[PDB]
Amino acid sequence: MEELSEGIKELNDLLIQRKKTLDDLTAQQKNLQDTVTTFETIISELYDVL
């Protein structure tokens, strides 16, 4: 019965850490998507102007 609670606590701690990591990854992915779309639209505008 005690290993059950210990495992529950370990799962909760790992979930919290992985959730922080997931938030960081979401921020990085959103920044990457914004950068990619910015570069793509700049390239398209540059080619049209060319």
Next chain:
Amino acid sequence: SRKLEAEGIFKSLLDTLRQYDSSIQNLTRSRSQLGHNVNDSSLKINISENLLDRDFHEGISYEQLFPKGSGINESIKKSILKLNDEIQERIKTIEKDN
């Protein structure tokens, strides 16, 4: 995957910007050959070559390089279209002169 894609697209963007600058210089030389000294910096577009070097925790957006009222479609494209219209008017004037 998106980091690899962003690195490739950034390299392509740098190459495209260099090509755009070369074409702008050629156009300026061609206009100046007829006495129309176009300001090279007016048509050139400046982009930081170390923009991608930032950590991805920091955001990069189109508004950072081109805020509202200053994008390529907003100002630069319209300015160069106005230049094309002015050159067409000069063509008409020189055709009447001929």
